[PDB]
Design a binder for this molecule. Structure first.
Ligand SMILES: *[C@@H]1O[C@H](CO)[C@@H](O[C@@H]2O[C@H](CO)[C@@H](O)[C@H](O)[C@H]2NC(C)=O)[C@H](O)[C@H]1NC(C)=O
Ligand SMILES: *[C@@H]1O[C@H](CO)[C@@H](O[C@@H]2O[C@H](CO)[C@@H](O)[C@H](O)[C@H]2NC(C)=O)[C@H](O)[C@H]1NC(C)=O
Ligand SMILES: *[C@@H]1O[C@H](CO)[C@@H](O[C@@H]2O[C@H](CO)[C@@H](O)[C@H](O)[C@H]2NC(C)=O)[C@H](O)[C@H]1NC(C)=O
Ligand SMILES: *[C@@H]1O[C@H](CO)[C@@H](O)[C@H](O)[C@H]1NC(C)=O
Ligand SMILES: *[C@@H]1O[C@H](CO)[C@@H](O)[C@H](O)[C@H]1NC(C)=O
Ligand SMILES: *[C@@H]1O[C@H](CO)[C@@H](O)[C@H](O)[C@H]1NC(C)=O
Lengths: 169, 328, 169, 328, 169, 328
């Protein structure tokens, strides 16, 4: 029952946010979703499907008549031109979606690292990376300390010397 | 004594394609192709007319069918499949081109061209246009000798387009059932019709003969139309076989905002009923297409403000991060 | 009046380069733009707007006549085909620009980190990251030392032991 | 004791769209859509001819208008709006197709077809082609009976394309003002004209009648043209009503580099003046389009080496890093 | 004759893999290609050129006749429409290739760092980065230790204290 | 005491373009444009017919040329360049439209329309259709007066489409060499032909005259065709000049899988030989295009399952990492 982070795994457990903190200390185990980075991912995702409209919509009218056929010589060309244009628009939509899709998958990976990098830099010399996306903390960090790491107030000087003795011998 | 950074995952996420790779599992996804349509015409907040049995071109010249719709005002115009533009067998010259004008007209206003006649039958009636009793096109006069086999008068008419909007003018050439019938109707000898406008001139002659019997008539009437600029005279000159406009047709989207004006219609072709409760800006033969999605697979030929048409039945769009199921 | 780097901020002050060094030490405060990475960003940016030409230019002739109209049946189709092709080329240009634009914005972010990563690796164990894009140096670094860090000659052994005592107690 | 890494920023950078996000502020940007054009035709370093009053097709057969331009040599050819291809009312068969040939010709060289006549008036003149005194097409002969109402001779002509370049051959059919005038001019009885080439044969007959009076003439002349491969005979056979080519038209871009040769022109339609000082490779009705930018919003129908045409008035292109204004 | 890694250089020597380890210790010098990351790059690369098919292929028939020409008025339009569509498909293919190409070049750079980051995190506090893509190891690592680093079994505790004395004084 | 992480490189890697930069050197690359084609038609595993001298339309009505191919069954159909659809000079109405039907037919099955005649010559033969001795179209009868200059009978024929597949029906109008020859053949006076179907009716009259001598004949025969829905009667009524269908043409891809059925052919136009050893799904005038690559620069107009056509002769695709040559 040890705990790991994003590197190797996803948390089926985290259910009130996209990205989150999982911790353990003398008090026990906690999980909190992180709001700001969740909203950041979500904001970039919403407006998708509205972006695809407003890029691909047009105003058009009848060139050929279904009820009484126009002349076949020209009629053939209009069908040929219409099918050829559909090939082009089909190619385009399948590509535009695969782009927007590459982009959602990637920027999410991006928001995770944005956050982890923040925390690494925040802990300075008091913590070390296990490499599952987790930080090993060489001081005693307790549920009001954890919330500091999270709420972005962790002051690394308050614990530095403790951590350094704990880290070297 | 530790802290871990994580992201959410779910047990059974949907598969989406990316440029790099195919069927990547992810947390959430939405469809981007619309494939079901509303089989109604969605006319809410729009002013719509269902011609029904009325052919569209018939609105101009008035068969009994088109009696309701002679001066119609419409934002959206719906043609229907078994509709007949004509009561007495004939066809419009440049027909497909003429309709496209009407569909986008906004509707049409009619005013009399002011023609008057001296020595002729103008009340020509046919079995083909029944209407309580045999009748003709509502908007035209059928001109006959006033005594059978009496040679028809060389006559001239000029009508000039007073209004700012270009007028629509339609006229007829009658090809009689038999060489006899032409004689009985218009007298005997050479028959010539000439139509003159500042941009338009042409000459027509009947080529009388039997043709397959439609509506009970071997004879045919052919309609030719023109657009007349303001201040322009159309001159009508004919010794007979001539079907004469009584009224000029004016588009409503050329009006001066003088309350006739009802601008810019979309004319569709639909097999579906009408529905003033639902809303639509895209239409096709099946009904309306109204959808949050940006593509449709439903019909190539859809018209109005429409989702792009694509071959594919589905392209699913990612709405969340890549799904990485949790490990032991 | 403390100084920070790129992470949170841009320098309105840096006006002879794209990327730069801001330092303070016993002598005072200095700012130098960095040439090589500036030129690297600039080289990739120039040739934009020449790249868009040479991808999107064609040789063509009159198919329809303005002065005397060609037949309307065909005339309608040529207008329809021309408008439909314009839809396609419009879609394409707005996408190609949004690509080249995503690319300039991104590769710039890229040149910054290329440079900062260089410097982090260059300082080895003598410095630590405040996390505003700045390095805290645990030895006495002086205006000829700073130029070393910049001109890529900083030798970390010359100062290592000094830095390590300064860093641990 | 510290070192910081930074990037530049500015106070008021421009907003640019990216695929991800809209209106991202950035340090520098440039426009990619060209929206203003040079309202001149920019002909510097190019050999250009302004037909002006001359219709283009008229260069082939020589109305008084086209007198300057019978043997013109041009890299760029400019048609103009009120230009008339004809002095005596008529129209070319396949007219739009014929011009497109001429526009890209390079210009045209003329040589005599060598025809000679025995017993006929060849000097036919008209009020329509005035030119000091009444005249005709410069490049054709009008053939008449040499005595009024005298029945016209069954004649035959063969001309063979000696040159390597395919020749351009134009001929006329005359539809006389009245049934009388045909008689007065060409005598009486059946009139037949047949034109024969190894790929081409057709027969023409006058259909004499009054037609609306243009240029003072009820009569019409219709021009039919062909392309003749080298070593091919065109055979002209006619009993009258026939307007005869005097000269063959040869394109300059089919020349053998024998110094007539002036290859590959672009024919444009323009309302703008000419300017040999400025430079252009793209032209439209307004003028030239010359621009560093790769798109234009100016005109769909522009021709030459052109910027792509796009709906949008602006797409702004980033030239610098994302702008991140400095903080307290 | 010192050895460097990917940062500045490519190894013309590595010829049984895409990515690899180059080491030296008391025993001497060794090079091993890494299989898993090679296969990972290769798998993403293969299926290219099959992906381009299945995106750009169509079924079509004759609209115009070479042997007997169809009417010239319409004939001109079909040539114009066909050339215009070819412009569009040409633009598209040159872009699609330049994408797939940007992608191969980039994901390769990506697999390298994926691997180096793994190893950095794996060595924890026992090694330091020279910055040529190499790790300096402050303990005695020997050909069975090297294979551990590679085969992903390096246990950093077994050598930590040795490395820390070796690193600080 | 060290460990290094590296990637492979090579001395002389190929240059590839990327969106960002041009001619980036890389380890491996492959071509994406196919530029050489197999100059054969690759028919392996496909059922193919080479019409050769046979024009395609000729399969319907049977000149001596098309004798082999009257009832052909084909997956792939190859037209050839000097092929003549006709033995006696004439042309099909809607010709280009008619062939496109045949190319995709699958081949054609023939059955007799069952017509019989009473008092007429039906055995009309010509120098034009030689075939051991002078002959006619295999699938038609030429109808003549049975005594020279004898006025031809007003006759009527009805044939009704029994089969589920729509039938193909072809008929002829004969324009005689001289006004005399019409008389000699069909007697004298007015000549009228009318063809009637539930969707089709039209009337044809000979316009007899000399025309340039092809195949030794000044006279012409013109073929008109129709598609007949099941259960529909085509009625043939004529006083002469009429060339009569003997057999109806049925497409094979409208068959009920009753073993005639050979579905959905692709008709190509090719100058290349045939080859049942190689395999192809894309064809052009040169031969087959079969390639691993996804684009071709070979021919715009290629047909079948084809690589996309592109202007460019090469776009090279990266197959490996960016090449970074090793340093001292
Ligand atoms: C997950 O994706 C779905 C679509 O798959 C989103 O749900 C749609 O939400 C809108 C807004 O309520 C509704 O109008 C649609 O009916 C929903 N569609 C379906 C099929 O659910 C949902 O918003 C997304 N949520 C997250 C968190 O990803
Ligand atoms: C910033 O962008 C501008 C364009 O917005 C560049 O300026 C153009 O520079 C060329 C070369 O001198 C001139 O021909 C144009 O007239 C300029 N246009 C405008 C409107 O300025 C400028 O080069 C870019 N510079 C930087 C540093 O970004
Ligand atoms: C390197 O790229 C080449 C193509 O340039 C690949 O080789 C092709 O390989 C297939 C499969 O054997 C053959 O059918 C082709 O004939 C080869 N083409 C050429 C010109 O070599 C090769 O697979 C790639 N290998 C690596 C490791 O990149
Ligand atoms: C960090 O902790 C130290 C402990 O003395 C304190 O002096 C300081 O104000 C704290 N805050 C910051 C941001 O340094
Ligand atoms: C680094 O500094 C040390 C100090 O002794 C010196 O010996 C060495 O040559 C320097 N240069 C490098 C690149 O190590
Ligand atoms: C690491 O090495 C230490 C040495 O005592 C050992 O106890 C431990 O089981 C090793 N393995 C791991 C994965 O910690």
């Amino acid at each position: 029952g040890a705990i790991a982070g994003f590197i190797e795994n996803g948390w089926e457990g985290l259910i009130d946010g996209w990205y989150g903190f999982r911790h353990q200390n003398a008090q026990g185990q906690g999980t909190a979703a992180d709001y700001k980075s969740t909203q950041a991912a979500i904001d970039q995702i919403t407006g998708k499907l509205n972006r695809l409209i407003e890029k691909t919509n047009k105003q058009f009218e009848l060139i050929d008549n279904e009820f009484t056929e126009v002349e076949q010589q020209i009629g053939n060309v209009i069908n040929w031109t219409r099918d050829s244009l559909t090939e082009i628009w089909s190619y385009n939509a399948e590509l535009l979606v695969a782009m927007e899709n590459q982009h959602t998958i990637d920027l999410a990976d991006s928001e995770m690292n944005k956050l982890y990098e923040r925390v690494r830099r925040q802990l300075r010399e008091n913590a070390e990376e296990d490499g599952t996306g987790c930080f090993e903390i060489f001081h005693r960090c307790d549920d009001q300390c954890m919330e500091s790491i999270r709420n972005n107030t962790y002051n690394h000087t308050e614990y530095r010397q403790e951590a350094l003795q704990n880290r070297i011998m | 004594d530790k802290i871990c950074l994580g992201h959410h995952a779910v047990a059974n996420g949907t598969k989406v394609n990316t440029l790099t790779e195919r069927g990547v599992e992810v947390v959430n996804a939405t469809e981007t192709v619309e494939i079901t349509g509303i089989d109604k015409v969605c006319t809410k907040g729009k002013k719509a007319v269902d011609l029904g049995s009325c052919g569209i071109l018939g609105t101009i010249i008035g068969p009994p069918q088109c009696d309701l719709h002679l001066e119609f005002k419409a934002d959206l115009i719906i043609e229907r499949r078994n509709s007949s533009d004509i009561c007495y067998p004939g066809r419009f010259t440049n027909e497909e081109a003429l309709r496209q004008i009407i569909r986008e007209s906004g509707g049409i206003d009619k005013e009399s061209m002011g023609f008057r006649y001296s020595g002729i039958r103008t009340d020509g009636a046919t079995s083909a246009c029944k209407r309580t009793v045999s009748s003709f096109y509502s908007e035209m006069k059928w001109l006959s000798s006033s005594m059978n086999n009496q040679v028809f008068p060389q006559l001239n008419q000029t009508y000039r387009n007073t209004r700012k909007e270009p007028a629509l003018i339609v006229w007829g050439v009658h090809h009689s059932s038999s060489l006899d019938e032409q004689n009985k109707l218009y007298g005997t000898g050479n028959k010539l019709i000439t139509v003159g406008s500042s941009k338009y001139q042409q000459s027509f002659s009947p080529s009388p003969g039997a043709r397959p019997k439609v509506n009970g008539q071997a004879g045919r009437i052919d309609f030719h139309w023109m657009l007349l600029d303001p201040g322009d005279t159309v001159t009508f000159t004919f010794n007979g076989a001539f079907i004469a406009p009584d009224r000029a047709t004016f588009l409503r989207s050329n009006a001066p905002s003088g309350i006739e004006y009802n601008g810019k219609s979309l004319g569709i072709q639909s097999d579906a009923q009408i529905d003033e409760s639902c809303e639509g800006e895209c239409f096709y033969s099946g009904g309306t297409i109204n959808s949050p999605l940006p593509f449709q697979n439903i019909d190539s030929r859809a018209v109005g403000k429409c989702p792009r048409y694509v071959k594919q039945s589905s392209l699913p769009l990612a709405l969340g991060m890549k799904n990485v199921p949790e490990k032991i």
